[PDB]
Amino acid sequence: MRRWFHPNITGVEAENLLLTRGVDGSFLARPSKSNPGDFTLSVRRNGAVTHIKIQNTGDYYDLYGGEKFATLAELVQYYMEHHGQLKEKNGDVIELKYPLN
Amino acid sequence: SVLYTAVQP
Numbered sequence: 001m002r003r004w005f006h007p008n009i010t011g012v013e014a015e016n017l018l019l020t021r022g023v024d025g026s027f028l029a030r031p032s033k034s035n036p037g038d039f040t041l042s043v044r045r046n047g048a049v050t051h052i053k054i055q056n057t058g059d060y061y062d063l064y065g066g067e068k069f070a071t072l073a074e075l076v077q078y079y080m081e082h083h084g085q086l087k088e089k090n091g092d093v094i095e096l097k098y099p100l101n
Numbered sequence: 102s103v104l105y106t107a108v109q110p
Contacts, residue, residue, distance in 0.1 A: 011103035033102065042103075050106045066110040089107040 002073050004028045004099035014042040015049035025097030029076060039072055043094055
């Protein structure tokens with residue numbers, strides 16, 4: 001939970017929101033449709049929107065590998081401040097810069 | 102639905 005978390009937005013709405021009000025760097029966290037109960041990060045980068053699933057194992061949260069965190073907010077806050085730690089599978093850096101709404 | 106991006110640790 002915090003100023004990027006949208007408790008009631010779909011993936012689609014999220015990428016329309018990011019493509020209309022966001023800028024390159026804008027992100028939010030939302031509920032996951034594939035895994036009800038979990039959250040997803042959506043980020044506007046390059047000329048599109050990237051969606052990253054967040055694993056809640058039942059013990060911790062992570063990005064299906066990488067650093068683990070006790071709450072969802074510690075996850076996001078970490079990747080927002082630690083430069084270069086969020087990367088796609090292919091190695092390109094994902095930037096978590098502007099918390100939307 | 103939407104498309105997902107895996108992350109590299």
